From a paper:
One of the first identified was the pseudouridine synthase 1 (hPus1p), which is a member of the TruA family despite their low sequence similarity (<20%;). We have characterised the catalytic domain of the hPus1p protein biochemically and structurally. We determined the structure of the catalytic domain of ΔhPus1p and the D146A mutant of this enzyme. The atomic model shows the typical fold for a pseudouridine synthase from the TruA family.
Residue numbers in the entry: 83 to 102, 108 to 349, 352 to 394
Write the structure that this text describes.
């Protein structure tokens, strides 16, 4: 009866992505919507009768601190609580807002910010450094990482950073506003670092390949010259990092609020930022960290380089 937008978050492990194998995030969401009585059962079976859309089709294993979806529901009392009561702890609806009927979240959002949490031995040189959990990131290596990541900034032909895309395809070009790596931190004897990237839009496997290539370079499996060569017309076999560390941090609506905001209303989750950071630190990060500690996801992939 009313078109709403939802701010939600989830740990991606144990799912096969957001949309569409294991269950998906939307499977849990739909079930929670049906059980709570926000939508009738047929709206859950056919996700078009409630006009359901999602901003980011996060891949298998990928987490999200600020996923955004839009749909029509029965605005039942305490709707946020009710929906959450049918969800596991690792999926939370953080915010809800009533929007105009014509609002399409996927078609209206601009830039996305992702982070990538990884063990620091992903930057350990294969010839000079230890290759296990005992490795500690040096200041010089971090400088190298940030120097390389900075080269991604601006507009480039990113055809080598996805699949089945030609160099002459205009849609292969993408815009990177920012990319860097934060200072490392230790948790339970393991050192991690957070890579953050902001882009106007991303192609399939793009961030994982951007990270993978820099990892290959820093570790010494590829010369630095391959980076600048990668945005040329030539094809480059770019390594694809695991999806475990990848987290969707924010879906931006700044350009939407400017261009459309003045049949449309401004969308802003600034008030829910506390819950966003809380869920990331309490449910997203610890699962990634624990998984790396016990299953050695990154280490296994690094072996294949
Ligand atoms: N929408 C294309 C993919 C973007 C990256 C991230 N959302 C993922 O699927 O892993």
């Amino acid at each position: 009866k009313r078109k709403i937008v939802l701010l939600m978050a989830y740990s991606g492990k144990g799912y096969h992505g957001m949309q569409r194998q294991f269950k998906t995030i939307e499977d849990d969401l739909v079930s929670a919507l049906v059980r709570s009585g926000c939508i009738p059962e047929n709206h859950g079976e056919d996700m078009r009768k409630m006009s359901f859309q999602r901003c980011a089709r996060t891949d298998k294993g990928v987490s999200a601190a600020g996923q955004v979806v839009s749909l029509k529901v029965w605005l039942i009392d305490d709707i946020l609580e009710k929906i959450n009561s049918h969800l596991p702890s690792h999926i939370r609806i953080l915010g809800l807002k009533r929007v105009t009927g014509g609002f399409n979240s996927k078609n209206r959002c601009d830039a996305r910010t992702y982070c990538y949490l990884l063990p620091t031995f992903a930057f350990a040189h294969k010839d000079r450094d230890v290759q296990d959990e005992t490795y500690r990131l040096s200041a010089e290596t971090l400088q190298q990482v940030n120097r390389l990541l900075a080269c991604y900034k601006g507009t480039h032909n990113f055809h080598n950073f996805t699949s089945q895309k030609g160099p002459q395809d205009p849609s292969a070009c993408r815009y990177i506003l920012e990319m860097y790596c934060e200072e490392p931190f230790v948790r339970e004897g393991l050192e991690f670092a957070v890579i953050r990237v902001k882009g106007q839009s991303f192609m399939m496997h793009q961030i994982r390949k951007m990270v993978g290539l820099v990892v290959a370079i820093v570790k010494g499996y590829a010369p630095e010259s391959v980076l600048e060569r990668s945005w040329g017309t030539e094809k480059v076999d770019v390594p694809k990092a695991p999806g475990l560390g990848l987290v969707l941090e924010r879906v931006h609506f700044e350009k939407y609020n400017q261009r459309f905001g003045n049949l449309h209303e401004p969308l802003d989750w600034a008030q829910e930022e506390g819950k966003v950071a809380a869920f990331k630190e309490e449910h997203i990060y610890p699962t990634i960290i624990g998984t790396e500690r016990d299953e050695r996801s990154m280490a296994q992939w690094l072996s294949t380089l």
